[PDB]
Amino acid sequence: TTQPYTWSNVAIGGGGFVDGIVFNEGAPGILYVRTDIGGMYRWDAANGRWIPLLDWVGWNNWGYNGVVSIAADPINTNKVWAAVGMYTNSWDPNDGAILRSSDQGATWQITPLPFKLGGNMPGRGMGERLAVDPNNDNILYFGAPSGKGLWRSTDSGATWSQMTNFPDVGTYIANPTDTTGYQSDIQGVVWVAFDKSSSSLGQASKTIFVGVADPNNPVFWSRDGGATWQAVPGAPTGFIPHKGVFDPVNHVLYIATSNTGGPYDGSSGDVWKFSVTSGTWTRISPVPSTDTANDYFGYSGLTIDRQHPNTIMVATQISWWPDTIIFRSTDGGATWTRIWDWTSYPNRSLRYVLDISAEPWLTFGVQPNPPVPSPKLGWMDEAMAIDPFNSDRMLYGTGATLYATNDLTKWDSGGQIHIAPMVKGLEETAVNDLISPPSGAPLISALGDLGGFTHADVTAVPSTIFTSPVFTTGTSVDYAELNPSIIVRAGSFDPSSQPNDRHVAFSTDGGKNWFQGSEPGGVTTGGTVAASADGSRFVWAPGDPGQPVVYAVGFGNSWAASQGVPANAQIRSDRVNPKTFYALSNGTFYRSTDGGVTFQPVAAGLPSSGAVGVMFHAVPGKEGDLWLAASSGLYHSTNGGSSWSAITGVSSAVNVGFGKSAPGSSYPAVFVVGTIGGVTGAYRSDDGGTTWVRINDDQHQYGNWGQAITGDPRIYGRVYIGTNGRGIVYGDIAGAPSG
Ligand SMILES: [K+]
Ligand SMILES: [K+]
Ligand SMILES: [K+]
Ligand code: NA
Ligand code: NA
Ligand code: NA
Ligand code: NA
Ligand code: NA
Ligand code: NA
């Protein structure tokens, strides 16, 4: 049974790291971006929006939203490829793949690779790893991580094998002692740049450069179309090349280097040019690494203006304070100017005007504090690209958004360029928790990096992230079910930089304004929080490992330890009885009936394994009525957790929530991301779990989604589902069910 639905994103706009930008060099108006956890997009200029291309990716192949590299075919501009896969350690159970499309990513074919890829690993801002030969589109190269070396396809990306003659698989490892495998992987072969001049169309390009993450040997080349390879003689040492771009008009290679792989660091590095004709390397760094006093950054975001290839740009990788710097040269690197300069301290002259009218929350809840701007130009600007058909258009990514200008050449004439977010249709947040209260705002969200929002209108970008306090990352939100103006949120931030602020905070006006009391010592992460049905008391399991579960009678006025419940348990409140709280920890279920003061175990040997951890939740209006989502099934208790029953027909559930009952039912509608009849997706039941209807489809899957889910108690059929890198999606009924 299926039901047609309409799916949309809650309006936020960007919110994550956009770590590559690829224009097609073959025809105008063809532009793609990649993200680390949130797929890739194509720019739709007619409608002024980004179109997501990988939302067909689901739970079975969820790593494919980790986009390692994009190549765009300049001979047949309908063609585009992507390298995909998210981690190279145990955290992604699947190998990566090369995806190919002949309709600009509307549809794709998949070739899995025999090894994992690192879309969300260290070094992900380096690239592009994947490249198409601009003289023969049958031929592609891919620089692989993990010591897999350099790969090639000679059938336009359908099949791949290793170039076993390539002499250096990479040596650089960010932290070889990391036993999780996250920092300890070889970063590998990091970009391929063709010399289009080195052949005529219809014949493979003979001269190929390859960037390698090996500070002693950062660049290799071939002159015979890959039959033989050598280190480019005289290549500079000591740094990893984030970027390599060839200019076949003047016959030079440009590289931008840093002492780390990025994307969060980089404290020294250089920009160099290599002349094919003379063999001469020329250092062209705006601030050279040999100027140890002043060079506090490496370099990345390397781009050439293809209409005027003496024009090149680069960005600091990385300058945290006072802001990033973006540099421009209109003479091949001989001289540079910058996007801002010191005048006399803390004053600066700016070559730009930054307008965040469409994305006002980008101040991150903080006023400008000279010399520090708010909003900032950016940070983690590994990606930057001038449009190869329009010198005035340039984009650059940051850790939180994508910025663009359409008047770039005003820079050269002594004016200010105009920069603004370019994120319509691009939603890249990672969602930890969601509530839809029965009065006030429709939706309050707990998000990675932004903290979260009170969303007055899910179609309108909010004005501000949560403030007083600002959270770096929101982990949990709740409301008092019978006093729904009372809201509680918990979250994560470094205490040393916010000592007046707390990791748990409150509102009595439905999330419009917040306030805070106290907290236990040593809290840095949010964990889970639960509000009593009357809003008079709260039970909180702070996030740091081993923090005792605590309760407050009041708004965090003061906290005392809850007896009988393990640190870091998942805490929920009953939606009816203001003195009843529940917890789940390592297969044991606990209940308190004295408002969180004491808990006792009431069931055990329960599910502890789930795709987003085991989730459970209490039902509005039904005392003691609990639903629990786990890898082995969806389970239901009607006696406060003392006993549980499998819901027949659901083989697995990621998460469960509730919304407004159907006409003629007095039970809330139940929504799950789960598996029914061998099909994983979103489902709603209007009769208390007896029957289920599928409410999404195979084009609307969103990968590892379901960390958060809630229905809307004011809108029958409406569901809000958190994703991990595609923001908050929501669904409405758009038709009658099939049966
Ligand atoms: K949107
Ligand atoms: K040039
Ligand atoms: K609700
Ligand atoms: Na990220
Ligand atoms: Na490895
Ligand atoms: Na730095
Ligand atoms: Na256990
Ligand atoms: Na236990
Ligand atoms: Na009803």
Coordinates of N, CA, C and O in Angstrom, one line a residue, residues 66-221:
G66 N 28.3 10.7 0.4 CA 29.6 11.3 0.6 C 30.2 11.5 -0.8 O 30.7 10.5 -1.4
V67 N 30.3 12.7 -1.2 CA 30.8 13.0 -2.6 C 32.2 13.4 -2.6 O 32.6 14.5 -2.3
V68 N 33.1 12.4 -3.0 CA 34.5 12.6 -3.1 C 35.1 13.6 -4.2 O 36.0 14.4 -4.0
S69 N 34.5 13.4 -5.4 CA 34.9 14.2 -6.5 C 33.8 14.2 -7.6 O 33.0 13.4 -7.6
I70 N 33.8 15.3 -8.4 CA 32.9 15.4 -9.5 C 33.8 15.8 -10.8 O 34.7 16.6 -10.6
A71 N 33.5 15.1 -11.9 CA 34.1 15.5 -13.2 C 33.0 15.8 -14.2 O 32.0 15.0 -14.3
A72 N 33.1 16.8 -15.0 CA 32.1 17.2 -15.9 C 32.7 17.1 -17.3 O 33.8 17.7 -17.6
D73 N 32.0 16.6 -18.3 CA 32.6 16.2 -19.6 C 32.5 17.4 -20.5 O 31.3 17.9 -20.8
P74 N 33.6 17.9 -21.0 CA 33.5 19.1 -21.8 C 33.2 18.9 -23.3 O 32.9 19.8 -24.0
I75 N 33.3 17.6 -23.7 CA 33.1 17.2 -25.2 C 31.6 17.0 -25.4 O 30.9 17.4 -26.4
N76 N 31.0 16.2 -24.4 CA 29.6 15.9 -24.4 C 29.0 16.4 -23.0 O 29.1 15.7 -22.0
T77 N 28.5 17.6 -23.0 CA 28.3 18.4 -21.8 C 27.1 17.9 -21.0 O 26.8 18.3 -19.8
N78 N 26.3 16.9 -21.5 CA 25.3 16.2 -20.9 C 25.9 15.2 -19.9 O 25.2 14.7 -18.9
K79 N 27.2 14.9 -20.0 CA 27.8 13.9 -19.1 C 28.5 14.4 -17.9 O 29.1 15.4 -17.9
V80 N 28.4 13.6 -16.8 CA 29.0 14.0 -15.5 C 29.2 12.7 -14.7 O 28.5 11.7 -14.9
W81 N 30.3 12.7 -13.9 CA 30.6 11.6 -13.1 C 30.8 12.1 -11.6 O 31.3 13.3 -11.3
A82 N 30.7 11.1 -10.7 CA 31.0 11.4 -9.4 C 31.6 10.2 -8.7 O 31.2 9.1 -8.9
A83 N 32.6 10.4 -7.9 CA 33.2 9.4 -7.0 C 32.5 9.6 -5.6 O 32.5 10.7 -5.0
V84 N 32.0 8.4 -5.1 CA 31.2 8.5 -3.9 C 31.6 7.4 -2.9 O 32.1 6.3 -3.3
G85 N 31.2 7.6 -1.6 CA 31.6 6.7 -0.5 C 32.0 7.6 0.6 O 32.6 8.6 0.4
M86 N 31.7 7.2 1.9 CA 31.8 8.2 2.9 C 33.0 8.0 3.9 O 33.6 9.0 4.1
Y87 N 33.3 6.8 4.4 CA 34.4 6.7 5.2 C 35.2 5.4 4.8 O 34.6 4.6 4.1
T88 N 36.5 5.4 5.1 CA 37.3 4.2 4.8 C 37.6 3.3 5.9 O 38.2 2.3 5.7
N89 N 37.1 3.7 7.1 CA 37.1 2.9 8.3 C 35.8 2.1 8.5 O 35.0 2.1 7.5
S90 N 35.6 1.5 9.6 CA 34.4 0.6 9.9 C 33.1 1.4 9.8 O 32.0 0.9 9.7
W91 N 33.2 2.8 9.8 CA 32.0 3.5 9.9 C 31.1 3.5 8.7 O 29.9 3.9 8.8
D92 N 31.7 3.2 7.5 CA 30.9 3.0 6.3 C 31.1 1.5 6.0 O 32.2 1.1 5.7
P93 N 30.0 0.8 6.0 CA 30.2 -0.7 5.7 C 30.3 -1.0 4.2 O 30.7 -2.1 3.9
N94 N 30.2 0.0 3.4 CA 30.2 -0.3 2.0 C 31.4 0.3 1.3 O 31.9 1.3 1.6
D95 N 31.7 -0.4 0.2 CA 32.8 0.2 -0.7 C 32.3 1.5 -1.4 O 31.1 1.8 -1.5
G96 N 33.2 2.3 -1.9 CA 32.7 3.4 -2.8 C 32.4 3.0 -4.2 O 32.4 1.8 -4.5
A97 N 32.0 4.0 -5.0 CA 31.7 3.8 -6.4 C 31.9 5.0 -7.3 O 32.1 6.1 -6.7
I98 N 32.1 4.7 -8.6 CA 32.0 5.8 -9.5 C 30.6 5.8 -10.2 O 30.1 4.8 -10.7
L99 N 29.9 6.9 -10.1 CA 28.6 7.1 -10.7 C 28.8 7.8 -12.0 O 29.6 8.7 -12.1
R100 N 28.0 7.4 -13.1 CA 28.1 8.1 -14.3 C 26.7 8.5 -14.8 O 25.7 7.7 -14.6
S101 N 26.5 9.7 -15.4 CA 25.3 10.1 -15.9 C 25.5 10.7 -17.3 O 26.5 11.4 -17.6
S102 N 24.4 10.6 -18.2 CA 24.4 11.2 -19.5 C 23.3 12.2 -19.6 O 22.9 12.7 -20.7
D103 N 22.7 12.6 -18.4 CA 21.6 13.6 -18.3 C 21.9 14.6 -17.2 O 20.9 15.1 -16.5
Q104 N 23.1 14.9 -16.9 CA 23.5 15.9 -15.9 C 23.0 15.5 -14.5 O 22.7 16.4 -13.7
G105 N 22.9 14.2 -14.3 CA 22.7 13.7 -12.9 C 21.3 13.5 -12.6 O 21.0 13.2 -11.5
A106 N 20.4 13.6 -13.6 CA 19.0 13.2 -13.4 C 18.9 11.7 -13.2 O 18.2 11.3 -12.3
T107 N 19.6 11.0 -14.0 CA 19.7 9.5 -13.8 C 21.1 9.0 -13.8 O 22.0 9.7 -14.4
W108 N 21.4 7.9 -13.1 CA 22.8 7.4 -13.0 C 23.0 5.9 -13.2 O 22.0 5.2 -12.9
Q109 N 24.2 5.5 -13.6 CA 24.6 4.1 -13.5 C 25.7 4.0 -12.5 O 26.6 5.0 -12.4
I110 N 25.8 2.9 -11.8 CA 26.8 2.7 -10.7 C 27.8 1.6 -11.0 O 27.4 0.6 -11.4
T111 N 29.1 2.0 -10.9 CA 30.2 1.0 -10.8 C 30.9 1.0 -9.5 O 31.7 1.9 -9.2
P112 N 30.5 0.0 -8.6 CA 31.2 0.0 -7.3 C 32.7 -0.3 -7.6 O 33.1 -1.0 -8.5
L113 N 33.5 0.2 -6.7 CA 35.0 0.1 -6.6 C 35.3 -1.0 -5.6 O 34.5 -1.2 -4.8
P114 N 36.5 -1.6 -5.8 CA 36.8 -2.6 -4.8 C 37.4 -2.1 -3.5 O 38.2 -2.9 -2.9
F115 N 37.1 -0.9 -3.1 CA 37.7 -0.3 -1.9 C 36.8 0.8 -1.4 O 36.0 1.3 -2.2
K116 N 36.9 1.2 -0.2 CA 36.1 2.3 0.3 C 36.7 3.7 -0.1 O 37.8 3.8 -0.4
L117 N 35.8 4.7 -0.1 CA 36.1 6.1 -0.4 C 35.8 6.9 0.8 O 35.0 6.5 1.8
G118 N 36.3 8.2 0.8 CA 36.3 9.0 2.0 C 35.7 10.4 1.8 O 36.2 11.4 2.2
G119 N 34.4 10.4 1.4 CA 33.7 11.6 1.2 C 33.6 12.5 2.5 O 33.6 13.8 2.4
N120 N 33.6 11.9 3.7 CA 33.6 12.7 4.9 C 34.9 12.4 5.7 O 34.9 12.4 7.0
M121 N 36.0 12.0 5.1 CA 37.3 11.9 5.8 C 38.2 13.2 5.8 O 38.0 14.1 5.0
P122 N 39.2 13.2 6.7 CA 40.3 14.2 6.5 C 40.8 14.2 5.1 O 40.9 13.2 4.4
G123 N 41.1 15.4 4.6 CA 41.6 15.6 3.3 C 40.6 15.8 2.2 O 41.0 16.1 1.0
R124 N 39.3 15.7 2.5 CA 38.2 15.8 1.5 C 38.1 17.0 0.7 O 37.5 17.0 -0.4
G125 N 38.6 18.1 1.2 CA 38.6 19.4 0.4 C 39.7 19.4 -0.7 O 39.6 20.3 -1.6
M126 N 40.6 18.4 -0.7 CA 41.6 18.4 -1.8 C 40.9 17.8 -3.0 O 40.0 16.9 -2.9
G127 N 41.3 18.2 -4.2 CA 40.8 17.7 -5.5 C 40.9 18.7 -6.6 O 41.5 19.7 -6.5
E128 N 40.2 18.3 -7.7 CA 39.4 17.1 -7.9 C 40.2 15.9 -8.2 O 41.0 15.8 -9.1
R129 N 39.9 14.8 -7.4 CA 40.5 13.5 -7.6 C 40.1 12.8 -8.9 O 40.9 12.1 -9.4
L130 N 38.9 13.1 -9.4 CA 38.4 12.5 -10.6 C 38.5 13.5 -11.7 O 38.2 14.7 -11.6
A131 N 39.0 13.0 -12.9 CA 39.1 13.9 -14.1 C 38.9 13.2 -15.4 O 39.2 12.0 -15.5
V132 N 38.2 13.9 -16.3 CA 38.0 13.4 -17.7 C 38.9 14.1 -18.7 O 39.2 15.2 -18.6
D133 N 39.4 13.3 -19.6 CA 40.4 13.8 -20.6 C 39.7 14.7 -21.5 O 38.7 14.3 -22.2
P134 N 40.1 16.0 -21.6 CA 39.4 16.9 -22.4 C 39.5 16.8 -24.0 O 38.9 17.5 -24.7
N135 N 40.4 15.9 -24.4 CA 40.5 15.5 -25.8 C 39.9 14.1 -26.1 O 39.9 13.7 -27.3
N136 N 39.4 13.3 -25.2 CA 38.8 12.0 -25.4 C 38.0 11.6 -24.2 O 38.7 11.1 -23.2
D137 N 36.7 11.7 -24.3 CA 35.9 11.5 -23.0 C 35.7 10.0 -22.7 O 34.9 9.7 -21.8
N138 N 36.4 9.1 -23.4 CA 36.4 7.8 -22.9 C 37.3 7.6 -21.8 O 37.3 6.5 -21.1
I139 N 38.3 8.5 -21.6 CA 39.4 8.3 -20.7 C 39.2 9.2 -19.4 O 39.0 10.4 -19.5
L140 N 39.2 8.5 -18.3 CA 39.1 9.2 -16.9 C 40.2 8.6 -16.0 O 40.5 7.4 -16.1
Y141 N 40.7 9.5 -15.1 CA 41.6 9.0 -14.1 C 41.0 9.4 -12.7 O 40.1 10.3 -12.6
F142 N 41.3 8.6 -11.7 CA 40.8 8.9 -10.4 C 41.9 8.7 -9.4 O 42.5 7.6 -9.3
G143 N 42.2 9.7 -8.6 CA 43.2 9.5 -7.5 C 42.5 9.0 -6.2 O 41.6 9.6 -5.7
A144 N 43.0 7.8 -5.8 CA 42.4 7.1 -4.7 C 43.1 7.3 -3.4 O 44.2 7.6 -3.3
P145 N 42.3 7.0 -2.3 CA 42.9 7.2 -0.9 C 43.5 5.8 -0.5 O 43.4 4.8 -1.3
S146 N 44.1 5.8 0.6 CA 44.3 4.5 1.4 C 45.4 3.6 0.8 O 45.5 2.5 1.3
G147 N 46.2 4.2 0.0 CA 47.3 3.5 -0.7 C 46.8 2.7 -2.0 O 47.6 1.9 -2.5
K148 N 45.6 3.0 -2.4 CA 45.1 2.3 -3.7 C 45.6 3.0 -4.9 O 45.4 2.4 -6.0
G149 N 46.3 4.1 -4.8 CA 47.0 4.7 -5.9 C 46.1 5.4 -6.9 O 45.1 6.0 -6.6
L150 N 46.5 5.3 -8.2 CA 45.8 6.0 -9.3 C 45.0 5.0 -10.1 O 45.7 4.0 -10.6
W151 N 43.7 5.2 -10.4 CA 42.9 4.4 -11.2 C 42.5 5.0 -12.6 O 42.6 6.2 -12.7
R152 N 42.2 4.2 -13.6 CA 41.8 4.7 -14.9 C 40.6 4.0 -15.5 O 40.5 2.8 -15.2
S153 N 39.8 4.6 -16.3 CA 38.8 4.0 -17.1 C 39.1 4.4 -18.5 O 39.5 5.6 -18.8
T154 N 38.9 3.5 -19.5 CA 39.1 3.8 -20.8 C 37.7 3.6 -21.6 O 37.7 3.6 -22.8
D155 N 36.7 3.5 -20.8 CA 35.3 3.2 -21.4 C 34.3 4.2 -20.8 O 33.2 3.9 -20.6
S156 N 34.8 5.4 -20.6 CA 34.0 6.5 -20.2 C 33.3 6.3 -18.8 O 32.2 6.7 -18.5
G157 N 34.1 5.6 -17.9 CA 33.8 5.4 -16.5 C 33.0 4.2 -16.1 O 32.6 4.2 -14.9
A158 N 32.6 3.4 -17.1 CA 31.9 2.2 -16.8 C 32.7 1.1 -16.1 O 32.2 0.5 -15.2
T159 N 34.0 1.0 -16.5 CA 34.9 0.1 -15.7 C 36.2 0.8 -15.4 O 36.6 1.7 -16.1
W160 N 36.8 0.3 -14.3 CA 38.0 0.9 -13.7 C 39.1 -0.1 -13.4 O 38.7 -1.2 -12.9
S161 N 40.3 0.2 -13.6 CA 41.4 -0.6 -13.0 C 42.6 0.2 -12.6 O 42.8 1.4 -13.1
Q162 N 43.4 -0.3 -11.8 CA 44.6 0.4 -11.2 C 45.6 0.6 -12.3 O 45.9 -0.3 -13.1
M163 N 46.3 1.8 -12.2 CA 47.5 2.1 -13.0 C 48.7 1.6 -12.2 O 49.2 2.4 -11.3
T164 N 49.1 0.4 -12.4 CA 50.0 -0.3 -11.5 C 51.4 0.3 -11.7 O 52.3 0.0 -10.9
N165 N 51.6 1.0 -12.8 CA 52.9 1.7 -13.0 C 53.0 3.0 -12.2 O 54.0 3.7 -12.4
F166 N 52.0 3.4 -11.5 CA 52.1 4.8 -10.9 C 53.0 4.7 -9.7 O 52.9 3.8 -8.9
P167 N 54.0 5.6 -9.5 CA 55.0 5.3 -8.6 C 54.8 5.7 -7.2 O 55.6 5.3 -6.4
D168 N 53.8 6.4 -6.8 CA 53.6 6.9 -5.4 C 52.2 7.0 -5.0 O 51.4 7.8 -5.5
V169 N 51.8 6.1 -4.1 CA 50.4 6.0 -3.7 C 50.0 7.0 -2.6 O 48.8 7.1 -2.2
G170 N 51.0 7.8 -2.2 CA 50.9 8.8 -1.1 C 51.5 8.2 0.2 O 51.4 7.0 0.5
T171 N 52.0 9.1 1.0 CA 52.7 8.8 2.3 C 52.0 9.5 3.5 O 52.1 9.0 4.6
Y172 N 51.4 10.7 3.3 CA 50.9 11.5 4.3 C 49.6 10.9 5.0 O 48.7 10.4 4.3
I173 N 49.7 10.9 6.3 CA 48.7 10.5 7.2 C 48.6 11.5 8.3 O 49.6 11.8 9.0
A174 N 47.4 12.0 8.6 CA 47.2 13.1 9.6 C 47.6 12.6 11.0 O 48.4 13.3 11.7
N175 N 47.1 11.5 11.4 CA 47.5 11.0 12.8 C 47.5 9.5 12.8 O 46.4 8.9 13.0
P176 N 48.6 8.8 12.5 CA 48.8 7.4 12.4 C 48.5 6.6 13.6 O 48.2 5.4 13.5
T177 N 48.3 7.3 14.8 CA 48.0 6.6 16.0 C 46.5 6.5 16.3 O 46.2 5.8 17.3
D178 N 45.7 7.1 15.5 CA 44.2 7.0 15.7 C 43.7 5.6 15.5 O 43.5 5.2 14.3
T179 N 43.3 4.9 16.5 CA 42.9 3.6 16.3 C 41.5 3.5 15.8 O 41.1 2.3 15.5
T180 N 40.7 4.6 15.7 CA 39.4 4.5 15.0 C 39.5 4.4 13.5 O 38.5 4.2 12.9
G181 N 40.7 4.7 13.0 CA 40.8 4.7 11.5 C 40.4 6.0 10.9 O 40.5 6.2 9.7
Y182 N 39.9 7.0 11.7 CA 39.4 8.2 11.1 C 40.6 9.1 10.6 O 40.5 9.7 9.5
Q183 N 41.6 9.3 11.4 CA 42.7 10.2 11.1 C 44.0 9.5 10.5 O 45.0 10.1 10.2
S184 N 43.9 8.1 10.5 CA 45.1 7.3 10.4 C 45.2 6.7 9.0 O 46.0 5.8 8.7
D185 N 44.4 7.2 8.0 CA 44.4 6.7 6.7 C 45.3 7.5 5.8 O 45.4 8.8 5.9
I186 N 46.1 6.8 4.9 CA 46.8 7.5 3.8 C 45.7 8.3 3.0 O 44.7 7.8 2.5
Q187 N 46.0 9.5 2.8 CA 45.1 10.5 2.1 C 45.2 10.2 0.5 O 44.2 10.3 -0.2
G188 N 46.4 9.9 0.1 CA 46.6 9.2 -1.2 C 46.9 10.2 -2.3 O 47.7 11.1 -2.3
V189 N 46.3 9.9 -3.5 CA 46.5 10.6 -4.7 C 45.3 11.6 -4.8 O 44.2 11.2 -4.9
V190 N 45.6 12.9 -4.9 CA 44.6 13.9 -4.6 C 44.1 14.7 -5.7 O 43.0 15.3 -5.5
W191 N 44.7 14.7 -6.9 CA 44.1 15.4 -8.1 C 44.8 15.0 -9.3 O 46.0 14.6 -9.3
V192 N 44.1 15.1 -10.4 CA 44.6 14.9 -11.8 C 44.3 16.1 -12.6 O 43.1 16.6 -12.6
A193 N 45.3 16.6 -13.3 CA 45.2 17.7 -14.2 C 45.8 17.3 -15.6 O 47.0 17.0 -15.7
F194 N 45.0 17.3 -16.6 CA 45.3 17.2 -18.0 C 45.9 18.5 -18.6 O 45.5 19.6 -18.3
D195 N 46.9 18.3 -19.5 CA 47.3 19.3 -20.5 C 46.6 19.1 -21.8 O 47.0 18.2 -22.6
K196 N 45.5 19.8 -22.0 CA 44.7 19.7 -23.1 C 45.5 20.1 -24.4 O 45.3 19.5 -25.4
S197 N 46.6 20.9 -24.3 CA 47.4 21.2 -25.5 C 48.2 20.0 -26.0 O 48.8 20.1 -27.0
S198 N 48.3 19.0 -25.1 CA 49.3 18.0 -25.4 C 48.8 16.9 -26.4 O 49.5 16.0 -26.8
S199 N 47.5 17.1 -26.8 CA 46.9 16.3 -27.9 C 45.9 17.1 -28.7 O 45.6 18.1 -28.3
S200 N 45.4 16.5 -29.8 CA 44.2 17.0 -30.5 C 43.0 16.2 -30.1 O 43.0 15.1 -29.7
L201 N 41.8 16.8 -30.2 CA 40.6 16.1 -30.0 C 40.5 14.8 -30.8 O 40.7 14.8 -32.0
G202 N 40.1 13.7 -30.2 CA 40.0 12.4 -30.7 C 41.1 11.5 -30.4 O 41.1 10.3 -30.7
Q203 N 42.1 12.0 -29.7 CA 43.3 11.3 -29.3 C 43.6 11.6 -27.8 O 43.5 12.8 -27.4
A204 N 43.9 10.6 -27.0 CA 44.2 10.8 -25.5 C 45.2 11.9 -25.3 O 46.2 12.0 -26.1
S205 N 45.0 12.8 -24.3 CA 46.0 13.7 -23.9 C 47.2 13.0 -23.4 O 47.1 12.1 -22.7
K206 N 48.4 13.4 -23.8 CA 49.6 12.7 -23.6 C 50.3 13.2 -22.3 O 50.9 12.4 -21.6
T207 N 50.1 14.5 -22.0 CA 50.7 15.0 -20.8 C 49.7 15.1 -19.7 O 48.6 15.7 -19.9
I208 N 49.9 14.4 -18.6 CA 49.0 14.3 -17.4 C 49.8 14.6 -16.1 O 50.9 14.0 -15.9
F209 N 49.4 15.5 -15.4 CA 49.9 15.8 -14.0 C 49.0 15.1 -12.9 O 47.8 15.1 -13.1
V210 N 49.7 14.6 -11.9 CA 49.0 14.0 -10.8 C 49.6 14.5 -9.5 O 50.8 14.4 -9.2
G211 N 48.7 15.0 -8.6 CA 49.0 15.5 -7.3 C 49.0 14.3 -6.3 O 48.0 13.5 -6.3
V212 N 50.0 14.2 -5.5 CA 50.1 13.2 -4.5 C 50.3 13.8 -3.1 O 51.1 14.7 -3.0
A213 N 49.6 13.2 -2.1 CA 49.8 13.6 -0.8 C 51.0 12.9 -0.2 O 50.9 12.0 0.6
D214 N 52.2 13.5 -0.6 CA 53.5 13.1 -0.2 C 54.3 14.4 -0.3 O 54.6 14.9 -1.4
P215 N 54.7 14.9 0.9 CA 55.4 16.2 0.9 C 56.7 16.2 0.2 O 57.2 17.2 -0.2
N216 N 57.3 15.0 0.1 CA 58.6 14.9 -0.6 C 58.5 14.7 -2.1 O 59.5 14.8 -2.8
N217 N 57.3 14.5 -2.6 CA 57.0 14.2 -4.1 C 55.6 14.5 -4.4 O 54.7 13.6 -4.5
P218 N 55.2 15.8 -4.4 CA 53.8 16.2 -4.5 C 53.2 16.1 -5.9 O 52.1 16.1 -6.0
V219 N 54.1 16.1 -6.9 CA 53.6 16.1 -8.3 C 54.3 15.2 -9.2 O 55.6 15.2 -9.3
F220 N 53.5 14.3 -9.9 CA 54.1 13.4 -11.0 C 53.5 13.8 -12.3 O 52.4 14.5 -12.4
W221 N 54.2 13.4 -13.4 CA 53.7 13.5 -14.7 C 54.0 12.4 -15.6 O 54.9 11.6 -15.4

